[PDB]
Amino acid sequence: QDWLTFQKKHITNTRDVDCDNIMSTNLFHCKDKNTFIYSRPEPVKAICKGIIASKNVLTTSEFYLSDCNVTSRPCKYKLKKSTNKFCVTCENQAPVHFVGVGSC
């Protein structure tokens, strides 16, 4: 919905996200999956530069991705690290929603 929420939900300052800890907090409420982007915020915000009306945009660059993926045991996760492009919804020159990995 907005840039601050997007960062809280998707930007990490470690690749080695502690899935079992972070996913169990109220922000993520033990949901099934979440993709974290290992990056300082500013190159992520730059994905949306110049884009005013809501639009989905795939990154030009590859990013380091850390996914928390739920196992067969509720609220227990595996950390999967990967490198890929990802798709965000840009609005008023900022990412406001994460769409998906690899494609819009």
Side-chain angles (χ1 to χ4, degrees), residues 2-104:
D2 51 67
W3 171 227
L4 169 66
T5 305
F6 177 97
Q7 292 178 71
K8 279 169 181 169
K9 299 183 131 187
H10 297 289
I11 290 180
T12 182
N13 301 293
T14 176
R15 285 211 85 194
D16 300 305
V17 174
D18 185 346
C19 301
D20 291 353
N21 197 7
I22 199 165
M23 296 293 290
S24 75
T25 63
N26 284 352
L27 184 43
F28 297 108
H29 50 91
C30 288
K31 69 200 313 297
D32 292 331
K33 181 181 186 197
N34 194 71
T35 299
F36 294 94
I37 303 158
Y38 171 70
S39 177
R40 52 202 91 193
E42 112 72 32
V44 174
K45 195 185 193 171
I47 297 164
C48 300
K49 183 73 193 68
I51 302 294
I52 306 307
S54 187
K55 190 179 172 183
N56 288 172
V57 176
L58 184 77
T59 59
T60 305
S61 305
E62 310 281 331
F63 283 82
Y64 276 139
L65 306 184
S66 292
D67 280 76
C68 294
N69 293 324
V70 76
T71 70
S72 71
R73 293 197 198 164
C75 219
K76 303 290 169 206
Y77 295 80
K78 285 185 181 224
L79 169 58
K80 273 168 174 45
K81 294 178 182 167
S82 68
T83 295
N84 223 310
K85 294 186 176 170
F86 58 87
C87 181
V88 300
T89 306
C90 296
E91 187 181 6
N92 192 25
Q93 316 196 250
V96 307
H97 282 288
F98 186 83
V99 175
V101 172
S103 183
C104 295

